[PDB]
Structures are given as structure tokens and as C-alpha cells.
Amino acid sequence: CSNLSTCVLGKLSQELHKLQTYPRTNTGSGTP
């Protein structure tokens, strides 16, 4: 519960892995 390390590692792991799988996050506009 008070396991901030586990929590943030868990997040970063899942979240960054999801970032990889996402179709396109880079929707902000377009690089010139």
C-alpha cells in the first residue's frame, strides 16, 4: 500500500509498454 517504489515501477512498466502498443500518441500536430 505505502509501496511507492512498486507503484511507480508498476505504472512505468505498464504505461510505457502501453505507449509502445498505442497506434499513434504523436497527434500534437506534425513535425516540420
PDB file of C-alpha atoms in Angstrom:
ATOM      1  CA  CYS A   1       0.000   0.000   0.000  1.00  0.00           C
ATOM      2  CA  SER A   2       2.669   2.505   1.113  1.00  0.00           C
ATOM      3  CA  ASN A   3       4.829   0.888  -1.626  1.00  0.00           C
ATOM      4  CA  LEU A   4       5.531   3.946  -3.798  1.00  0.00           C
ATOM      5  CA  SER A   5       8.507   2.167  -5.437  1.00  0.00           C
ATOM      6  CA  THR A   6       6.345  -0.807  -6.504  1.00  0.00           C
ATOM      7  CA  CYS A   7       3.535   1.564  -7.564  1.00  0.00           C
ATOM      8  CA  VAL A   8       5.698   3.830  -9.759  1.00  0.00           C
ATOM      9  CA  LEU A   9       7.641   0.864 -11.223  1.00  0.00           C
ATOM     10  CA  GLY A  10       4.293  -0.855 -11.930  1.00  0.00           C
ATOM     11  CA  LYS A  11       2.987   2.314 -13.601  1.00  0.00           C
ATOM     12  CA  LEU A  12       6.133   2.987 -15.675  1.00  0.00           C
ATOM     13  CA  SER A  13       6.262  -0.676 -16.778  1.00  0.00           C
ATOM     14  CA  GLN A  14       2.599  -0.880 -17.868  1.00  0.00           C
ATOM     15  CA  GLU A  15       2.277   2.756 -19.040  1.00  0.00           C
ATOM     16  CA  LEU A  16       5.475   2.748 -21.152  1.00  0.00           C
ATOM     17  CA  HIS A  17       4.587  -0.702 -22.526  1.00  0.00           C
ATOM     18  CA  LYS A  18       1.145   0.718 -23.457  1.00  0.00           C
ATOM     19  CA  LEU A  19       2.879   3.721 -25.119  1.00  0.00           C
ATOM     20  CA  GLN A  20       4.659   1.174 -27.373  1.00  0.00           C
ATOM     21  CA  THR A  21       1.354  -0.537 -28.299  1.00  0.00           C
ATOM     22  CA  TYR A  22      -0.639   2.704 -28.865  1.00  0.00           C
ATOM     23  CA  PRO A  23      -1.396   3.332 -32.590  1.00  0.00           C
ATOM     24  CA  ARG A  24      -0.161   6.952 -32.535  1.00  0.00           C
ATOM     25  CA  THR A  25       0.432   9.174 -29.481  1.00  0.00           C
ATOM     26  CA  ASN A  26       2.230  11.732 -31.674  1.00  0.00           C
ATOM     27  CA  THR A  27      -1.001  13.588 -32.587  1.00  0.00           C
ATOM     28  CA  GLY A  28       0.051  17.049 -31.266  1.00  0.00           C
ATOM     29  CA  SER A  29       0.295  18.440 -34.823  1.00  0.00           C
ATOM     30  CA  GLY A  30       3.109  17.326 -37.152  1.00  0.00           C
ATOM     31  CA  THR A  31       6.912  17.646 -37.150  1.00  0.00           C
ATOM     32  CA  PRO A  32       8.051  20.107 -39.892  1.00  0.00           C
TER      33      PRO A  32
END
